[PDB]
Design a protein around this ligand. Structure first.
Ligand SMILES: Nc1nc2c(ncn2[C@@H]2O[C@H](COP(=O)(O)OP(=O)(O)OP(=O)(O)O)[C@@H](O)[C@H]2O)c(=O)[nH]1
Ligand SMILES: [Mg+2]
Length: 718
């Protein structure tokens, strides 16, 4: 409730591999700061962070939780990312908002594949990294090995700050380097018995202290001058280097903490409030107009909303971060996107699932608000003097897609509303409503990511849903030139409705002009350029209606009747009932009755004539393909290439980058239906791929035959 200044706040986001001790460490930090009363164990299913229903039934974190700990004149805006693999949507969301990332390492395991994955996100976003070793009570541990495992993984910038005397359940003291003191503890935990380093470990402290002061010296030019003068920095002069070094991204500290037994948590909270990048020194964020927005406390107020947790039995809560300015209760704010004139009734400060009414949130601090009208994720709310509108968080591309569908076709509207709300909760649940496919597409990050969406629908809102294979957008085309003739006449009403049009059909490709000669069955037809028209279609492709009526043999105003007739049959498609594309149509000769021919006469004449041109020509089916850039380790490069060779892929590139590689391919979309599941199995969760549409190409005939037989099988049900 106590209003915190700009210099007294600081943003941290917890990262690390799954099952490393992030949620449990959060519980200890809140307990030692007095936010909660008694610790709740993850087995007891009463933790502060994992307060969601789905997040409890699994037993591990699903949604990152925003929460704070009050310490000595410093407030920490900790965000506890889930740390899994299929929930990286919330990891990038929290890592853009925050200003420093702490990576947790499991002592028993060491540097897992989850640790490697998250550290790549920090490199992408240029965020500080502090390595934090946890779970030191497991006997299957060796702190020397953990640094040894990590020393080659990342550069020599890594320097330790603490080391335990000995691991195992008997661990109750760890020798520090930053404060040159040994911190003993009791089995209950929470009571740091500060005590000067013993004689045996006195030898081990100096060289790392010499190493530690050396690491912080090079970070700042001024501190290097102090190194020459005094040859040693004791407490605070070397603390400034870590501030700049983390900004410089050239110093990764290593810690020790037992989150299970609350050993070092008080020391951990003291460190972060002591030396991390400030909200001011962190590289300023810029809005969509290029203005380098700075964390100015006195500037205009601007709310950025990034999380919209709608956890049941509490209500819709929309978290926000203030990029600049300050927020008083009962202020006036304008929605940058679709301005609804929102008035924040009362702001809140959030500590997991528990909120406390507060009267002010200075710039660069995370907050919360409840019961808003028209605020969605990504909407920026700001004052009337400035029209700031932020868009700087780019989520990773989709990696797995299924078409959701209710068990009964009566709750479709309800399922639309729920999915929209959950897309608001997690923006990575990309939903596209394709009219051509006539299906509700759900996009995520893997097979497991969409299963979590299913579970929330099944339990929280009591709606049954199922995931089905998504339809494929197929396009028709033709191979070789051909033609046909057709004539029409009907004398059941008034006029004869006479219509006869001879037209030539051939594929259209850019760069090749139309010839004036066509060899059809040992006969010659003359084509002249009377009209060059290329109408785009709403479903992609092109249509060319080159006309060659000889000087006015047929009426020169009756062409539009054929125009709508062709597209009527072009939309359907004879081979598979799908849209066609890239066809150049040549119309030259026809027979026209002087008075009995109207628009409907030629519309039917053109339509039926065009329909029969395909089966005399060569029809084909086009399969969309996606450019794929698989980031794969060198160890499993061979197995990944083989699988692509089973996907009818095309090897195009081979990039040797660090320990990993980078593979380029053009894999058909149908073969990419379930690749994220398959790629993880082959590699072991150490690879990622990116899809990118690259137009339609043809298919081998065996694929073509499979489609046509299935197409008629559905029609037989009538
Ligand atoms: N041996 C040992 N185990 C611990 C310690 N602290 C926590 N654990 C266990 O480690 C497990 C890891 O659980 P979490 O910390 O909740 O997992 P997380 O950090 O939220 O990451 P996710 O599993 O992806 O959600 C928990 O079930 C704890 O029981 C510890 O100090 N020593
Ligand atoms: Mg977790």
């Amino acid at each position: 409730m106590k209003v915190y200044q700009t210099n007294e706040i600081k943003n941290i986001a917890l990262l690390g591999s799954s099952g490393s001790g992030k949620t449990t460490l959060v519980e200890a930090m809140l307990f030692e700061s007095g936010v909660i009363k008694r610790r709740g164990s993850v087995a007891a299913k009463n933790t502060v962070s994992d307060y969601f229903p789905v997040e409890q039934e699994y037993g591990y974190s699903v949604f990152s939780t925003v929460l704070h700990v009050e310490w000595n004149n410093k407030k920490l805006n900790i965000i506890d990312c889930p740390g899994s693999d299929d929930f990286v949507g919330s990891t990038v969301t929290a890592l853009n908002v925050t200003d420093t990332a702490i990576i947790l390492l499991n002592g028993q395991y060491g540097v897992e594949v989850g640790t490697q994955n998250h550290f790549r996100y920090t490199e992408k976003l240029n965020k500080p990294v502090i390595f934090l070793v946890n779970q030191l009570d497991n006997e299957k541990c060796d702190y020397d090995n953990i640094l040894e495992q990590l020393k080659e993984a990342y550069g020599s910038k890594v320097v330790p700050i603490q080391y335990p005397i000995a691991t195992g359940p008997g661990f109750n003291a760890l020798i520090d380097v930053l404060l040159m003191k040994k911190y003993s503890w009791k089995p209950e935990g929470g009571a740091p018995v500060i005590e000067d380093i013993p004689a045996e470990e006195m030898d081990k402290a100096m060289e790392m202290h010499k190493a530690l002061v050396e690491a912080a010296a090079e970070n700042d030019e001024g501190l290097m001058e102090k190194f020459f003068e005094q040859d040693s920095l004791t407490e605070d002069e070397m603390r400034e280097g870590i501030r700049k070094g983390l900004i410089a991204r050239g110093m990764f500290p290593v810690f020790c903490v037992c989150g299970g037994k609350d050993m070092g948590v008080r020391r951990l909270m003291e460190f972060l409030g002591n030396v991390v990048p400030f909200v001011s020194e962190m590289p300023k964020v810029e809005n969509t107009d290029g203005k380098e927005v700075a964390p100015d406390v006195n500037g205009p107020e601007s709310l950025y909303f990034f999380k919209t947790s709608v956890e049941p039995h509490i209500g819709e809560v929309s978290y926000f971060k203030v990029m600049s300015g300050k927020v008083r209760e009962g202020d006036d704010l304008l929605n940058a996107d679709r301005g609804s004139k929102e008035r924040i009734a009362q702001i809140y400060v959030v500590a997991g699932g528990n909120r406390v009414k507060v009267e002010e949130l200075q710039a660069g601090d995370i907050g919360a608000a409840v019961k808003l009208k028209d605020v969605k994720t990504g909407n920026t709310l700001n004052g009337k003097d400035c029209d700031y509108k932020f868009n700087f968080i780019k989520y990773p591309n989709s990696k797995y897609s299924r078409a959701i569908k209710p068990v009964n076709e009566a709750d479709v509207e309800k399922m639309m509303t729920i999915l929209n709300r959950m897309r608001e909760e997690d923006p990575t649940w990309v939903i596209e409503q394709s009219k051509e496919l006539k299906q509700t597409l759900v996009h995520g990050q893997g097979e497991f990511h969409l299963r979590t969406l299913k579970w929330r629908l099944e339990n929280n809102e009591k709606l049954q849903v199922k995931f089905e294979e998504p339809k494929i957008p197929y396009r028709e085309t033709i191979t070789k030139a051909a033609r046909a003739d057709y004539r029409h006449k009907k004398q059941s009403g008034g006029a004869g409705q006479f219509g006869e049009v001879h037209l030539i059909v051939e594929p259209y490709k850019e760069g090749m002009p139309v010839p004036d000669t066509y060899k059809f069955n040992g006969q010659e037809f003359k084509i002249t350029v009377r009209g060059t028209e290329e109408i785009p279609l709403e479903w992609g492709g092109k249509l060319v209606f080159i006309n060659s009526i000889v000087g006015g043999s047929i009426d020169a105003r009756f062409l539009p009747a054929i125009m709508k007739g062709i597209m009527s049959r072009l939309e359907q498609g004879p081979l598979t009932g799908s849209y066609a594309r890239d066809v150049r149509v040549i119309v030259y000769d026809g027979k026209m009755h002087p008075v009995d021919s109207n628009e409907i006469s030629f519309m039917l004449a053109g339509r039926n004539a065009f329909s029969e041109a395909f089966k005399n020509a060569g029809p084909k089916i086009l399969e969309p393909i996606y450019d794929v850039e698989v980031f794969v380790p060198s160890d499993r490069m061979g197995d990944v290439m083989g699988d692509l060779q089973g996907r009818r892929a095309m090897i195009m590139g081979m990039s040797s980058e660090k320990g990993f590689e980078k593979l380029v391919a053009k894999v058909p979309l149908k073969e990419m239906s379930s690749y994220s599941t398959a790629l993880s199995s082959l590699t072991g969760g150490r690879a990622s791929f990116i899809m990118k549409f690259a137009s339609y190409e043809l298919v081998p005939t065996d694929v073509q035959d499979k489609l046509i037989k299935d197409f008629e099988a559905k029609q037989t049900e009538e």
